[PDB]
């Protein structure tokens, strides 16, 4: 046994004390438009960096964070619950938002990025991602062929859902999902 004089620390730990590295896009065609939103700047600015670091490891060249126009709502209410209207005051809810656009990104790889961000989401931040993908003609035919490919991947995932034989509480399958999603989503 001896002691080795380590020349440097692991690059994973060094990269944490550098600015988020960025890949280079050869073509520059957008593949994802992730828009984050919070009512507080601090949470948003932190997570925007945490997202760019994850995009570098996945080979996704990220561009941003682009500061989009902050959304400002306004209300003027009287300070009293009664006659005294000559005195009012203004309130607001400023929405601060950023944009991280990913260009020249593989469709599947871009989905792992969004999965990693949702699993490790920072509180107080809402996210919305638009995904683009190229596909050939004859969309209907492709969907049918994929069936067996998707079935094999769900073989081990069917365990999540379990119900009694001939579930009667559901009734009409489609009308259930349609109205269950309405209840889950608050009403719309």
């Amino acid at each position: 046994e001896q002691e080795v004089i380590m020349s440097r620390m692991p690059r994973s730990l060094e990269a944490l004390y550098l600015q988020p590295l960025r890949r280079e896009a050869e073509y520059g065609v957008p593949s994802c438009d992730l828009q984050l939103r919070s009512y507080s700047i601090r949470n948003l600015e932190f997570f925007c960096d945490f997202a760019l670091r994850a995009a570098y490891y996945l080979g996704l060249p990220a561009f941003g964070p682009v500061p989009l126009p902050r959304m400002i709502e306004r209300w003027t209410v009287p300070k009293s619950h009664f006659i005294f209207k000559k005195s009012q005051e203004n309130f607001e809810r400023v929405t601060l938002r950023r944009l991280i656009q990913i260009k020249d990104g593989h469709p599947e790889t871009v989905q792992l990025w969004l999965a990693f961000l949702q699993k490790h989401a920072y509180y107080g931040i809402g996210m919305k991602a638009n995904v683009w993908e190229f596909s050939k003609l004859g969309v209907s035919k492709a969907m049918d062929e994929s069936k067996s490919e998707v079935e094999k991947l769900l073989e081990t995932r069917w365990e999540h859902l379990s119900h009694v034989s001939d579930m009667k509480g559901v009734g009409n399958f489609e009308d259930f999902l349609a109205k269950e999603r309405l209840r889950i989503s608050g009403g719309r």
Partner: protein
Amino acid sequence: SASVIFSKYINNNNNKLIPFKIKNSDLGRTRYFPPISKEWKNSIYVFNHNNLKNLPLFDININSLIKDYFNLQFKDKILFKKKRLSKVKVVSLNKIYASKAEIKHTNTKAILTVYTFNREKISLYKKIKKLKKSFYFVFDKIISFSERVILSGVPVLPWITESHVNIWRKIIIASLYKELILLRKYKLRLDLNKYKFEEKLLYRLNNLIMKYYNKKVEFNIVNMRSFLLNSDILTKILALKLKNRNARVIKIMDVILNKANLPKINRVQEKASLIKSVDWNLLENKFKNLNLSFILNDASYAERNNLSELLNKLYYNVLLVSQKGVWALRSPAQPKVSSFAKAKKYAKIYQIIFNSINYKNMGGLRLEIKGRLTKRYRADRSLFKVKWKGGLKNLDSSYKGLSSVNMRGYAKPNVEYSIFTSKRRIGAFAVKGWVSGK
């Protein structure tokens, strides 16, 4: 070839190149950005605001549910306490006081933060200790003594089955019944107080709160050492004390202030301003050109190009036995940890983390009581009392002149306001309370 649709998004390349400019101006250190969860009780943003309108109403129900939860207590018949079934309304102060909950929302879960002042454990833990150590020592002798008399011959073996143990266990209970109940009472009351913060009972409260937000709720209960470090716990304790008709209002406030210790200060240095001078120790002013290529390129010192060497000269490293020394690793179930985790000393890190936090020391205290607090049961005029100790100002901005970050556009970041409403036999009264930090 290539698609025409694919070639219609390449030409749209008018992006600006990153310049890597060199700073020629001095930069001051950034403000102290206070935590986010302290501006609004619900730190949330949702794209469908249907999940955002009912929160003000739920938090009234959640706080009503966490209060009744921390007050849970055994039924006097479970502990053999022989309740005195009196028609009185006993006011209990030796319980767990909880504050208003603060939730950190995400699309997957909700972290509920509540600050508690456990006053019941301070009493239970003291009395369970009063039991002399000889109890457990002498009790151990009865176990061995009872195994040589009942489960043996005359002056765990295969011929000693379990059915015989049942009768062997009742003889010990028959002779120590009045004592085994005493120890059981204090242990159960302690474990209950302990499980209220563990998953043994929280998983039941989660099922109740989970029906409001439709997400699994995680708890971050923070145990407070003193009840003066929180405005919610302070105004509630003082309110329970004042609910008695015979309560001396003016006297109960002085007893609380006398318990509030403030740090000694220098009135001249505390109120002294701060001159604005370039801090050349800041990493922004040290290396105006942040690029590694310029720095590590034998700028001033020789053969320090190693990036790790540069970082060690800027941050406090734990992996190094010596502060600026080299990193030495030993050359060639149990927990999976590094072979040097024990050598790591978080002595100065605790000094870096806790020095980066403002509003730690309590430096201000104000109490206001207003309403019908007279003794005689008649129609009298309202009463109002106010007591304070220290200041509620922001020293970093009012005197030093530094820039602060006000909460909700108007509130000071260092003060905690809370109001508690109660009622006497003659009317309603409120207890307001401010608590500032230095």
